[PDB]
Design a binder for these strands. Structure first.
Ligand SMILES: NC[C@H]1O[C@H](O[C@H]2[C@H](O[C@@H]3O[C@H](CO)[C@@H](O)[C@H](N)[C@H]3O)[C@@H](O)[C@H](N)C[C@@H]2N)[C@H](N)[C@@H](O)[C@@H]1O
Ligand SMILES: NC[C@H]1O[C@H](O[C@H]2[C@H](O[C@@H]3O[C@H](CO)[C@@H](O)[C@H](N)[C@H]3O)[C@@H](O)[C@H](N)C[C@@H]2N)[C@H](N)[C@@H](O)[C@@H]1O
Ligand SMILES: NC[C@H]1O[C@H](O[C@H]2[C@H](O[C@@H]3O[C@H](CO)[C@@H](O)[C@H](N)[C@H]3O)[C@@H](O)[C@H](N)C[C@@H]2N)[C@H](N)[C@@H](O)[C@@H]1O
Ligand SMILES: [Mg+2]
Ligand SMILES: [Mg+2]
Ligand SMILES: [Mg+2]
Ligand SMILES: [Mg+2]
Ligand SMILES: [Mg+2]
Ligand SMILES: [Mg+2]
Ligand SMILES: [Mg+2]
Ligand SMILES: [Mg+2]
Ligand SMILES: [Mg+2]
Ligand SMILES: [Mg+2]
Ligand SMILES: [Mg+2]
Ligand SMILES: [Mg+2]
Ligand SMILES: [Mg+2]
Ligand SMILES: [Mg+2]
Ligand SMILES: [Mg+2]
Ligand SMILES: [Mg+2]
Ligand SMILES: [Mg+2]
Ligand SMILES: [Mg+2]
Ligand SMILES: [Mg+2]
Ligand SMILES: [Mg+2]
Ligand SMILES: [Mg+2]
Ligand SMILES: [Mg+2]
Ligand SMILES: [Mg+2]
Ligand SMILES: [Mg+2]
Ligand SMILES: [Mg+2]
Ligand SMILES: [Mg+2]
Ligand SMILES: [Mg+2]
Ligand SMILES: [Mg+2]
Ligand SMILES: [Mg+2]
Ligand SMILES: [Mg+2]
Ligand SMILES: [Mg+2]
Ligand SMILES: [Mg+2]
Ligand SMILES: [Mg+2]
Ligand SMILES: [Mg+2]
Ligand SMILES: [Mg+2]
Ligand SMILES: [Mg+2]
Ligand SMILES: [Mg+2]
Ligand SMILES: [Mg+2]
Ligand SMILES: [Mg+2]
Ligand SMILES: [Mg+2]
Ligand SMILES: [Mg+2]
Ligand SMILES: [Mg+2]
Ligand SMILES: [Mg+2]
Ligand SMILES: [Mg+2]
Ligand SMILES: [Mg+2]
Ligand SMILES: [Mg+2]
Ligand SMILES: [Mg+2]
Ligand SMILES: [Mg+2]
Ligand SMILES: [Mg+2]
Ligand SMILES: [Mg+2]
Ligand SMILES: [Mg+2]
Ligand SMILES: [Mg+2]
Ligand SMILES: [Mg+2]
Ligand SMILES: [Mg+2]
Ligand SMILES: [Mg+2]
Ligand SMILES: [Mg+2]
Ligand SMILES: [Mg+2]
Ligand SMILES: [Mg+2]
Ligand SMILES: [Mg+2]
Ligand SMILES: [Mg+2]
Ligand SMILES: [Mg+2]
Ligand SMILES: [Mg+2]
Ligand SMILES: [Mg+2]
Ligand SMILES: [Mg+2]
Ligand SMILES: [Mg+2]
Ligand SMILES: [Mg+2]
Ligand SMILES: [Mg+2]
Ligand SMILES: [Mg+2]
Ligand SMILES: [Mg+2]
Ligand SMILES: [Mg+2]
Ligand SMILES: [Mg+2]
Ligand SMILES: [Mg+2]
Ligand SMILES: [Mg+2]
Ligand SMILES: [Mg+2]
Ligand SMILES: [Mg+2]
Ligand SMILES: [Mg+2]
Ligand SMILES: [Mg+2]
Ligand SMILES: [Mg+2]
Ligand SMILES: [Mg+2]
Ligand SMILES: [Mg+2]
Ligand SMILES: [Mg+2]
Ligand SMILES: [Mg+2]
Ligand SMILES: [Mg+2]
Ligand SMILES: [Mg+2]
Ligand SMILES: [Mg+2]
Ligand SMILES: [Mg+2]
Ligand SMILES: [Mg+2]
Ligand SMILES: [Mg+2]
Ligand SMILES: [Mg+2]
Ligand SMILES: [Mg+2]
Ligand SMILES: [Mg+2]
Ligand SMILES: [Mg+2]
Ligand SMILES: [Mg+2]
Ligand SMILES: [Mg+2]
Ligand SMILES: [Mg+2]
Ligand SMILES: [Mg+2]
Ligand SMILES: [Mg+2]
Ligand SMILES: [Mg+2]
Ligand SMILES: [Mg+2]
Ligand SMILES: [Mg+2]
Ligand SMILES: [Mg+2]
Ligand SMILES: [Mg+2]
Ligand SMILES: [Mg+2]
Ligand SMILES: [Mg+2]
Ligand SMILES: [Mg+2]
Ligand SMILES: [Mg+2]
Ligand SMILES: [Mg+2]
Ligand SMILES: [Mg+2]
Ligand SMILES: [Mg+2]
Ligand SMILES: [Mg+2]
Ligand SMILES: [Mg+2]
Ligand SMILES: [Mg+2]
Ligand SMILES: [Mg+2]
Ligand SMILES: [Mg+2]
Ligand SMILES: [Mg+2]
Ligand SMILES: [Mg+2]
Ligand SMILES: [Mg+2]
Ligand SMILES: [Mg+2]
Ligand SMILES: [Mg+2]
Ligand SMILES: [Mg+2]
Ligand SMILES: [Mg+2]
Ligand SMILES: [Mg+2]
Ligand SMILES: [Mg+2]
Ligand SMILES: [Mg+2]
Ligand SMILES: [Mg+2]
Ligand SMILES: [Mg+2]
Ligand SMILES: [Mg+2]
Ligand SMILES: [Mg+2]
Ligand SMILES: [Mg+2]
Ligand SMILES: [Mg+2]
Ligand SMILES: [Mg+2]
Ligand SMILES: [Mg+2]
Ligand SMILES: [Mg+2]
Ligand SMILES: [Mg+2]
Ligand SMILES: [Mg+2]
Ligand SMILES: [Mg+2]
Ligand SMILES: [Mg+2]
Ligand SMILES: [Mg+2]
Ligand SMILES: [Mg+2]
Ligand SMILES: [Mg+2]
Ligand SMILES: [Mg+2]
Ligand SMILES: [Mg+2]
Ligand SMILES: [Mg+2]
Ligand SMILES: [Mg+2]
Ligand SMILES: [Mg+2]
Ligand SMILES: [Mg+2]
Ligand SMILES: [Mg+2]
Ligand SMILES: [Mg+2]
Ligand SMILES: [Mg+2]
Ligand SMILES: [Mg+2]
Ligand SMILES: [Mg+2]
Ligand SMILES: [Mg+2]
Ligand SMILES: [Mg+2]
Ligand SMILES: [Mg+2]
Ligand SMILES: [Mg+2]
Ligand SMILES: [Mg+2]
Ligand SMILES: [Mg+2]
Ligand SMILES: [Mg+2]
Ligand SMILES: [Mg+2]
Ligand SMILES: [Mg+2]
Ligand SMILES: [Mg+2]
Ligand SMILES: [Mg+2]
Ligand SMILES: [Mg+2]
Ligand SMILES: [Mg+2]
Ligand SMILES: [Mg+2]
Ligand SMILES: [Mg+2]
Ligand SMILES: [Mg+2]
Ligand SMILES: [Mg+2]
Ligand SMILES: [Mg+2]
Ligand SMILES: [Mg+2]
Ligand SMILES: [Mg+2]
Ligand SMILES: [Mg+2]
Ligand SMILES: [Mg+2]
Ligand SMILES: [Mg+2]
Ligand SMILES: [Mg+2]
Ligand SMILES: [Mg+2]
Ligand SMILES: [Mg+2]
Ligand SMILES: [Mg+2]
Ligand SMILES: [Mg+2]
Ligand SMILES: [Mg+2]
Ligand SMILES: [Mg+2]
Ligand SMILES: [Mg+2]
Ligand SMILES: [Mg+2]
Ligand SMILES: [Mg+2]
Ligand SMILES: [Mg+2]
Ligand SMILES: [Mg+2]
Ligand SMILES: [Mg+2]
Ligand SMILES: [Mg+2]
Ligand SMILES: [Mg+2]
Ligand SMILES: [Mg+2]
Ligand SMILES: [Mg+2]
Ligand SMILES: [Mg+2]
Ligand SMILES: [Mg+2]
Ligand SMILES: [Mg+2]
Ligand SMILES: [Mg+2]
Lengths: 47, 273
RNA sequence: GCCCGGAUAGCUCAGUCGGUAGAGCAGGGGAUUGAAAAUCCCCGUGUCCUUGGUUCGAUUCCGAGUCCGGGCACCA
RNA sequence: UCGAUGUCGGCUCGUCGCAUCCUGGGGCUGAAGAAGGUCCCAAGGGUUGGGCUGUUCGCCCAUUAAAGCGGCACGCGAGCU
RNA sequence: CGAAUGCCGGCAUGAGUAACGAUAAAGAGGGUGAGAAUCCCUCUCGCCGUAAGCCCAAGGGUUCCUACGCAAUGGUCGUCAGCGUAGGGUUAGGCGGGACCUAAGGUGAAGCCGAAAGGCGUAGCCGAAGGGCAGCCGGUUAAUAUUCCGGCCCUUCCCGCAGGUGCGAUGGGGGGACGCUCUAGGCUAGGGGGACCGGAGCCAUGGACGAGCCCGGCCAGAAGCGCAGGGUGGGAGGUAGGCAAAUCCGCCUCCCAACAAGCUCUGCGUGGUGGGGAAGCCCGUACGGGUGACAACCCCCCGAAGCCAGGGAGCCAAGAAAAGCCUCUAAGCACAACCUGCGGGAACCCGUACCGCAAACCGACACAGGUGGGCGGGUGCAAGAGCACUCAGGCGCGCGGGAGAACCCUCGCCAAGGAACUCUGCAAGUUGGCCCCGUAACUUCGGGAGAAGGGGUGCUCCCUGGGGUGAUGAGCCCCGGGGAGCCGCAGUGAACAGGCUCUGGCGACUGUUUACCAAAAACACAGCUCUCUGCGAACUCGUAAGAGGAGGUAUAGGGAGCGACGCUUGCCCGGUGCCGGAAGGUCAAGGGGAGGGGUGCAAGCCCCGAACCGAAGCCCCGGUGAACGGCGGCCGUAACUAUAACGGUCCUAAGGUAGCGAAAUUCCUUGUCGGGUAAGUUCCGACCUGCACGAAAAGCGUAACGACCGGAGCGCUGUCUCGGCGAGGGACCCGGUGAAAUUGAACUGGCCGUGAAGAUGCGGCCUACCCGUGGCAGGACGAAAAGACCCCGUGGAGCUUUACUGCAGC
RNA sequence: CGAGCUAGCCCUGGCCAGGGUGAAGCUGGGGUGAGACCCAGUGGAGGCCCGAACCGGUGGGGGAUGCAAACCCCUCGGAUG
RNA sequence: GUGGUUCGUGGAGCCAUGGGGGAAUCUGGGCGGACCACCGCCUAAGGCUAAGUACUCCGGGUGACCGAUAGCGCACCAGUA
RNA sequence: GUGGGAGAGGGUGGUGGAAUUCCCGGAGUAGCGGUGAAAUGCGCAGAUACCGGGAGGAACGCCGAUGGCGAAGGCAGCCACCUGGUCCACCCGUGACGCUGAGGCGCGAAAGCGUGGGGAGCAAACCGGAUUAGAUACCCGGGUAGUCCACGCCCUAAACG
């Protein structure tokens, strides 16, 4: 039956992408946190 | 005048459609249409601000002329009578003699082939717009400006009309379709006649779907909801209002007057609805 | 089974600061009528449900009891 | 027994008690006979099919030798409903 | 540390147990190899075939091809692999996207708003499965191909030559440019048939050397031409409108053509050329290659939902934009520029492997689930994408071998009976397609209707009516009509394919809903009523700006109730709400200051403060019921009796009107009576004593409708009396792989007792060799889940209100 | 941080085999003073009918450490809105 | 009208200020806890100003600090799988 | 046929004044209304009575008659349009073309009904005040359908001469 994850690449990038994060003071602080933790990816992969 | 249907289905027996006999032209004046964005009753936040709206047939907007006075004295011929989906009324196509085309909302009895014109001039006759002060007392009239230069506001709806009860000072006394008695300014244009398509109030939608076509989605009673939702929500099986009947936002809905008391336009009103 | 009300003239009901209790209708005697209603003039009258008790004195306050009006009997 | 002892009835499957419904054996009889009444012995076996209702129960139809009453966590849901 | 349903890890029990993932299905020969049911090859068998085949798009990301491998992954095996290692593989001016356009939305010079962060917003800009734009056929690789090659065609940019012309834009105008249903004519895709053309070969087993059987009989193609079709008037004059200008467009007038006539555009056909090309046999190919062959390459018929395409008709709910394109003029330039033809040159970036209804995507799995678009052959069955079989193609579902117990599942059949089963005909059966005959109550006249109930249905011959295409004819194809016979148990012979009636409740209806225990009588619904709202509307969201409402205007919009239709919808305004009320009472800040007080020598500075003036609110006056709501009781009375039309009285704001009534409502209750049944707590009809109906939380009806819920009957049945037999997949045995919850430890009997009151574990008796396997569920107060009922906690949370207190709002 | 599930709306596309019923209109005929209206033929309407795809999820059975954390089978509702 | 302070409206001054009214330049102004007198203190409505102070990504020294279930989540290619 | 007449004969569209009611302005004060008599009701929140302005509906005084017209039901301010019936005169035309009339068709007061409008006055129902033994009546105060318009129904009557 139809499940919760229905991949689409435009969505993924349009939504969790770098430019998106940067757009919003909330998301700029996501990058800040992930960078401080030293995440390898700051941002989901997509493609 | 209101086509009926034999009951060859249920709901085809109560359905009633407008009679389109008056309609001359079957596709609009391309220079005169523009697209109109459908809201869904949603504001510039994506938020519904008017409930139960949406779906329903796509429409092109007819840009219509509610200022008649920037054409003063230039006559025009009534080219066709057309169906405007954006209103109860019907719209008359005007060919002006200097070759501009306009839509006017179409008065009762106005027929194709007619000369029509606006100004302090001009005969008192159906289709002709004038500042109110020159329209003789007693004349029924429509498409009335509320303040000068600001466009037709009052009596635009199919069958509606206003009537001139008297002059006082700079202002004239109109009775509105509502029956309110209103001072309006003398220089406000009004075009003479009623709106016509008066038959309009008797159409009988006839089924649920036909309401949907006009873009009105179903409407659920407060009675049918739960207390989270509405003053009338809840309460084991059915039940009465159990309080003064309210809106979902909890203000009272039988009789409570919502006109702001201290409005300035108060000085200009004489009566009720 | 548990809580509430009520009992006052023949009927329907009022009232009581614990001291001499009333309204209507009925009823009795007279008038009026040919006669009968309607009308008029006189007329009363109950031991205030029972039984204890308080008090100088209880329809009135107390505690029990009848019998009628009523409400309840929910979670299982 | 609340860090769970599933709770009415039906069904299936039994098993026991006797304060015996029938069949067996008796006494008394207001027991002529036949048919009963009542009490005594007796638990081996038996103890129907339907209409109504979730019903247990109970009432009704049609039969019967009779259509017995109780217990078994109101017997039985790791057996079904 | 021994306990915390503790934490982390290790290893046990259950147990060689359940299971090994669709019941489409296998068998043998050969091969390879240490090893083979499981890999390759052949033959045979089976399954899919509107797919289980083929091609796009997403998403996945080397899974692709090849060699070498088998430790682990693979539910077994494994020499195989979507696995390990390694090497190779994706080629474009024309396909997709970008260097083009705009949609919703986004963003956003201007601008507005907001403590900050930020919110809005015109122009513009971004944004696509929409608009715009130039490639078709075939060949080639182990692996890419509209990409490489071959053939035949084309686009844009730059430069030039020729001819043409007032050239010229982000400005103007035209166009692009649109719905839904139905549909004409001509075509193509696709298909069937041919005695015609071409082809290896075949004659079995009784027959056939045959006008036999088997196979194939095309594809693409510029210009021209031809057939069908879309678009489309020409000229003059006037001109104040299209935010400058316009010779364009609009508007008025006059003159010509009404028509594809012309012009133009597109489909199809034909076309220089190019290509393809079966069966069968051989070659060994893993997989293809040789030949068939100088292959033929034509006639007929059916024929789209596709094309001509902006076709036509009807209807109401009235059906994007912008660029490309054409036209017009403006600066400016006219040696420019542009237009047409020709010719050379120039033509970038990204994608292209493979999977793709799935073992490669979403579902932790090589998961019986989910996933958009196109193609989807044949024959038969009325049709069809249905059904059965089948082609191309693809599969036999990654554990097998056996046995032929119980029991389970899925399936077949059954004497007599036929609902007796049961909460209930739950389940199963019956019915079943098409043609003809026939069809009631009632009804809103449409329906009810497939009412119900019947007859027909195959094949053979003979005769015969109408149509399409052809020619008006043959042939092909479509629809029938009449007659005479033949066969079986049976002719919609297999598959797909309503059981029917009567009568109540509720809801008018089609719809909608608790994803995952409720599909309903609930929601919605057209429709009816009340109410607000005069437009910068009321209302809603937002601190605001803004926005929705609505580019709408009272025939409109919001809110509430009721809920098609029919006939109707009574009385009460005391209380509450809303509405009206320029009086009166009360009323806060403020005004006002009679009077009083602090201090100083004083002038003074400072504080308190009566009258009186003073909003909305409340009080007060009234109105209002499709506003919140409410709509009694007692006693007497008629010439049998009984009852009580009548009278009396208490109380109230007034005491339930019509209709209906033991009801989706009736406690007593299985009310009483009638109906139905042999028998009826249900059901239908009455009655009225309505615990505790009653008129828009609508009253009473209503045709039609319903996977709603009652009650009856016919039909038919394994529901049942009451079971039996049979089939397959399990269960059982053998070989391979091998879990699970649970588990203080266990050397774990019965009775009668006792015990914290239900004992394998204590007492006394009884019974009892050790250990398994297939079975059944009575017990281990079996497992599971720290009871969801109940209480408790000065625990929580949702909801309400004339609870308290605030806040938004007004 | 989430509307890649789910709910509503906005923009832009696509899809719905085959059969059946036969509204208006139209045209003819009849009728009339004219009409209403009646009959035929044509026409092809509809939250119309049967039934695939597609969307559902009605009843029963199975499953219940599943094939599956909602599935399978039989049956059933809608199918131009 | 509020905030700050120990000050929660208190006898409530002080410092700050959203609203209203609204001065003077030394004989001017603020303050010493309502107010007044006296006596003092101080000079608002512009600005800058090291050090002594806080911290530890980083480097170094030292531990009656851990010793791979400890010590940082990470002694190991960990903010990784 | 010609030439004339009379009339509230019908359909349509316009249009006038009186009055009632409401609203606004003015002025003015204690009662108005009502009846058998009263009360309810209205009125110091300024009623009644008076003047001026406005709004809206319905009906048309005098003329007016015991009169006229219509087949009946019916028809009454004024104006115009459209249109029926009818009488007279002249003796011109047709040449028995006539009378009636089952069925049919059409009209048909009031009330009532549907959908819209409209609503001043009146007014079933209803409320209230009186009267009465009662009073679901007569009288008074309110008052909703209705009365009016359009369109479609109903088809009745002491539709009577
Ligand atoms: N109703 C449940 C059970 O009843 C009977 O047995 C019970 C029995 O009932 C009686 O049985 C008799 C024998 O048939 C009858 O004749 C009696 N009328 C009856 O009361 C009881 O005396 C027992 N204590 C219990 C037993 N289960 C049945 N035999 C069973 O099949 C049935 O399942
Ligand atoms: N018991 C004898 C009769 O009594 C009543 O009638 C009286 C009536 O009762 C009234 O009933 C009303 C309802 O019906 C109530 O609402 C009145 N409040 C009440 O007073 C009295 O108001 C009359 N004065 C006398 C009348 N005979 C009954 N109506 C009758 O059925 C009964 O038969
Ligand atoms: N059939 C034709 C005509 O017959 C009559 O006219 C007559 C007309 O009547 C006049 O009609 C008028 C309309 O009603 C009245 O206003 C006059 N008062 C009256 O005298 C006579 O004056 C003529 N002499 C003869 C005419 N036949 C009808 N009345 C008219 O309607 C009709 O048009
Ligand atoms: Mg997941
Ligand atoms: Mg995408
Ligand atoms: Mg920043
Ligand atoms: Mg890295
Ligand atoms: Mg926006
Ligand atoms: Mg937003
Ligand atoms: Mg209508
Ligand atoms: Mg609505
Ligand atoms: Mg609703
Ligand atoms: Mg609810
Ligand atoms: Mg909410
Ligand atoms: Mg609420
Ligand atoms: Mg409520
Ligand atoms: Mg209720
Ligand atoms: Mg409710
Ligand atoms: Mg409000
Ligand atoms: Mg009393
Ligand atoms: Mg005494
Ligand atoms: Mg005498
Ligand atoms: Mg005493
Ligand atoms: Mg005493
Ligand atoms: Mg409970
Ligand atoms: Mg409770
Ligand atoms: Mg317990
Ligand atoms: Mg347990
Ligand atoms: Mg005995
Ligand atoms: Mg015996
Ligand atoms: Mg004897
Ligand atoms: Mg004897
Ligand atoms: Mg025995
Ligand atoms: Mg039963
Ligand atoms: Mg019991
Ligand atoms: Mg019983
Ligand atoms: Mg018990
Ligand atoms: Mg039990
Ligand atoms: Mg049990
Ligand atoms: Mg169970
Ligand atoms: Mg049970
Ligand atoms: Mg157990
Ligand atoms: Mg311990
Ligand atoms: Mg431990
Ligand atoms: Mg083990
Ligand atoms: Mg075991
Ligand atoms: Mg086993
Ligand atoms: Mg097994
Ligand atoms: Mg398998
Ligand atoms: Mg198998
Ligand atoms: Mg070998
Ligand atoms: Mg070998
Ligand atoms: Mg083999
Ligand atoms: Mg097959
Ligand atoms: Mg096929
Ligand atoms: Mg993946
Ligand atoms: Mg790999
Ligand atoms: Mg391996
Ligand atoms: Mg293996
Ligand atoms: Mg596996
Ligand atoms: Mg590999
Ligand atoms: Mg190329
Ligand atoms: Mg491109
Ligand atoms: Mg470039
Ligand atoms: Mg763009
Ligand atoms: Mg923004
Ligand atoms: Mg900003
Ligand atoms: Mg695109
Ligand atoms: Mg392209
Ligand atoms: Mg080409
Ligand atoms: Mg390939
Ligand atoms: Mg030019
Ligand atoms: Mg064919
Ligand atoms: Mg062919
Ligand atoms: Mg040949
Ligand atoms: Mg032979
Ligand atoms: Mg031969
Ligand atoms: Mg063969
Ligand atoms: Mg011009
Ligand atoms: Mg210009
Ligand atoms: Mg077109
Ligand atoms: Mg067209
Ligand atoms: Mg110039
Ligand atoms: Mg490729
Ligand atoms: Mg593929
Ligand atoms: Mg699938
Ligand atoms: Mg597909
Ligand atoms: Mg695959
Ligand atoms: Mg598999
Ligand atoms: Mg799968
Ligand atoms: Mg998977
Ligand atoms: Mg699908
Ligand atoms: Mg068929
Ligand atoms: Mg097809
Ligand atoms: Mg099929
Ligand atoms: Mg057989
Ligand atoms: Mg049988
Ligand atoms: Mg039978
Ligand atoms: Mg039943
Ligand atoms: Mg069934
Ligand atoms: Mg019948
Ligand atoms: Mg019919
Ligand atoms: Mg039939
Ligand atoms: Mg029927
Ligand atoms: Mg029927
Ligand atoms: Mg037959
Ligand atoms: Mg045959
Ligand atoms: Mg069949
Ligand atoms: Mg089928
Ligand atoms: Mg069948
Ligand atoms: Mg059928
Ligand atoms: Mg019932
Ligand atoms: Mg329904
Ligand atoms: Mg559910
Ligand atoms: Mg749920
Ligand atoms: Mg349903
Ligand atoms: Mg619902
Ligand atoms: Mg209704
Ligand atoms: Mg605003
Ligand atoms: Mg706005
Ligand atoms: Mg707006
Ligand atoms: Mg708008
Ligand atoms: Mg509304
Ligand atoms: Mg409702
Ligand atoms: Mg009511
Ligand atoms: Mg009230
Ligand atoms: Mg009130
Ligand atoms: Mg009141
Ligand atoms: Mg006052
Ligand atoms: Mg006040
Ligand atoms: Mg009051
Ligand atoms: Mg008597
Ligand atoms: Mg009642
Ligand atoms: Mg009853
Ligand atoms: Mg009954
Ligand atoms: Mg009841
Ligand atoms: Mg009962
Ligand atoms: Mg039954
Ligand atoms: Mg029942
Ligand atoms: Mg009944
Ligand atoms: Mg009710
Ligand atoms: Mg109500
Ligand atoms: Mg209802
Ligand atoms: Mg009913
Ligand atoms: Mg009816
Ligand atoms: Mg019904
Ligand atoms: Mg339905
Ligand atoms: Mg249903
Ligand atoms: Mg029942
Ligand atoms: Mg039955
Ligand atoms: Mg069986
Ligand atoms: Mg078997
Ligand atoms: Mg024991
Ligand atoms: Mg021991
Ligand atoms: Mg011991
Ligand atoms: Mg065992
Ligand atoms: Mg057991
Ligand atoms: Mg607990
Ligand atoms: Mg407490
Ligand atoms: Mg608490
Ligand atoms: Mg609580
Ligand atoms: Mg969504
Ligand atoms: Mg149709
Ligand atoms: Mg139909
Ligand atoms: Mg349908
Ligand atoms: Mg398809
Ligand atoms: Mg199901
Ligand atoms: Mg369900
Ligand atoms: Mg199930
Ligand atoms: Mg089970
Ligand atoms: Mg269907
Ligand atoms: Mg403070
Ligand atoms: Mg305090
Ligand atoms: Mg302070
Ligand atoms: Mg101070
Ligand atoms: Mg300040
Ligand atoms: Mg000073
Ligand atoms: Mg200071
Ligand atoms: Mg100081
Ligand atoms: Mg001091
Ligand atoms: Mg100081
Ligand atoms: Mg410092
Ligand atoms: Mg370690
Ligand atoms: Mg560690
Ligand atoms: Mg170690
Ligand atoms: Mg370790
Ligand atoms: Mg660690
Ligand atoms: Mg006249
Ligand atoms: Mg007169
Ligand atoms: Mg003569
Ligand atoms: Mg003659
Ligand atoms: Mg009439
Ligand atoms: Mg009338
Ligand atoms: Mg009156
Ligand atoms: Mg009265
Ligand atoms: Mg009288
Ligand atoms: Mg009225
Ligand atoms: Mg008369």
């Amino acid at each position: 039956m139809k499940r919760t994850w229905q991949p689409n690449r435009r969505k993924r990038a349009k939504t969790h992408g770098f430019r998106a994060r940067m757009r919003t003071p909330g998301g700029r602080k996501v990058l800040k946190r992930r960078r401080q933790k030293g995440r390898w990816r700051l941002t989901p992969a997509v493609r | 005048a209101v086509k009926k249907f034999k009951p060859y289905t249920p709901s085809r027996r109560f359905m009633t459609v407008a009679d389109f006999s008056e309609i001359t032209k079957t596709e609009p004046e391309k220079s005169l249409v523009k697209p109109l964005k459908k809201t869904g009753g949603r504001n510039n936040q994506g938020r519904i601000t008017v409930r139960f709206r949406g779906g329903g047939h796509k429409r092109l907007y007819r840009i219509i002329d509610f200022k008649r006075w920037d054409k003063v004295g230039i006559p025009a011929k009534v080219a066709a009578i057309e169906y405007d989906p954006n209103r109860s009324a019907r719209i008359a196509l005007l060919h002006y003699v200097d070759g501009e085309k306009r839509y006017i909302i179409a008065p009762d009895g106005l027929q194709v082939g007619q000369q029509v014109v606006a100004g302090p001039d001009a005969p008192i006759q159906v289709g002709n717009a004038l500042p109110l002060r020159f329209i003789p007392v007693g004349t029924v009239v429509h498409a009335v400006e509320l303040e000068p230069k600001k466009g037709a506001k009052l009596a635009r709806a199919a069958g509606t009309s206003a009537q001139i009860q008297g002059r006082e000072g700079d202002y004239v006394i109109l009775r509105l379709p509502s029956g309110e008695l209103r001072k309006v300014h003398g220089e406000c244009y009004a075009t003479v006649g009623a709106v016509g398509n008066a038959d309009h109030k008797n159409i009988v939608l006839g089924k649920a779907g036909r309401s949907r076509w006009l873009g009105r989605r179903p409407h659920v009673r407060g009675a049918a909801m739960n207390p989270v939702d509405h003053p009338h929500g809840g309460g084991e099986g059915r039940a009465p209002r159990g309080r003064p009947p309210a809106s979902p936002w909890g203000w009272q809905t039988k009789g409570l007057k919502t006109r702001k008391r201290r409005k300035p336009s108060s000085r200009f009103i004489i009566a009720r609805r």
